[PDB]
């Protein structure tokens, strides 16, 4: 669809779309950029993630509103409209997963890129799991688990405990354990051990790296306070 636009122009327009808070456009520009077939830089990976996280985040919030109304109600309209939003959400998740599978993950050899993409894979299966009810729901949960686990294994071997991607991965995998997998103790354990191991490595960091690591540590702490 964006096949006729230059890669650099798609990236530029994704940055403009973010500034304009046009996240659907942003996501379309970034999908076009990925489909050029070249690997993404650090900055470009963040544009891709920001775009789709915002699009699906809005769909999730709408699905939650509609699901609440539907549950209180229990004509067909609320269920029909919740189903419409759900199908759209699933479509976006499938699109992101398709970009990761064709071919971002397989071409990502550096630990930072590969962990980034596997964290995304876990997240979009997690979003699918939030709305799943059918014969494949266990399998969707396991797909999220498997992606997060591979990312964790690489991160623990290849990155310091304060690395922001490693920290964000652990944060999100802990949310998976608490909210999806019905494993609140695993969630609490992961968040605690992540926080403590990062704390012990902060002394190695510059001011700017310290700010990033402590920002995510505070999110881990905020969850621990909510969960305990």
């Amino acid at each position: 669809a964006m096949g006729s636009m230059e890669r650099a122009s798609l990236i530029q327009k994704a940055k403009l779309a973010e500034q304009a808070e046009r996240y659907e456009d942003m996501a379309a520009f970034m999908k076009g950029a990925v489909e050029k077939g070249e690997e993404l830089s650090c900055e470009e990976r963040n544009l891709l993630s920001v775009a789709y996280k915002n699009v699906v985040g809005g769909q999730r919030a709408a699905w939650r509103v509609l699901s609440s109304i539907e549950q209180k109600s229990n004509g067909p309209e609320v269920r029909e409209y919740r189903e419409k939003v759900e199908t759209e959400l699933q479509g976006v998740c499938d699109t992101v997963l398709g970009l990761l599978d064709s071919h971002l993950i397989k071409e990502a050899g550096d630990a930072e890129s590969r962990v980034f993409y596997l964290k995304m894979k876990g997240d979009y299966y997690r979003y699918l799991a939030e709305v799943a009810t059918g014969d494949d729901k266990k399998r969707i949960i396991d797909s999220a688990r498997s992606a997060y686990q591979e990312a964790m294994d690489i991160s623990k071997k290849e990155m310091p405990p304060t690395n922001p991607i490693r920290l964000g991965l652990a944060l999100n995998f802990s949310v998976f354990h608490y909210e999806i997998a019905n494993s609140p103790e695993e969630a609490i354990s992961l968040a605690k051990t992540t926080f403590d191991e990062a704390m012990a490595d902060l002394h190695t960091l510059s001011e700017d790296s310290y700010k990033d690591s402590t920002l995510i540590m505070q999110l881990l702490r905020d969850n621990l306070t909510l969960w305990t």
Binding site: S49, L171, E179, D222
Partner: peptide, 9 residues
Amino acid sequence: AGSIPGRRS
């Protein structure tokens, strides 16, 4: 609870 935001803000 909360997952990571897309940007530091």
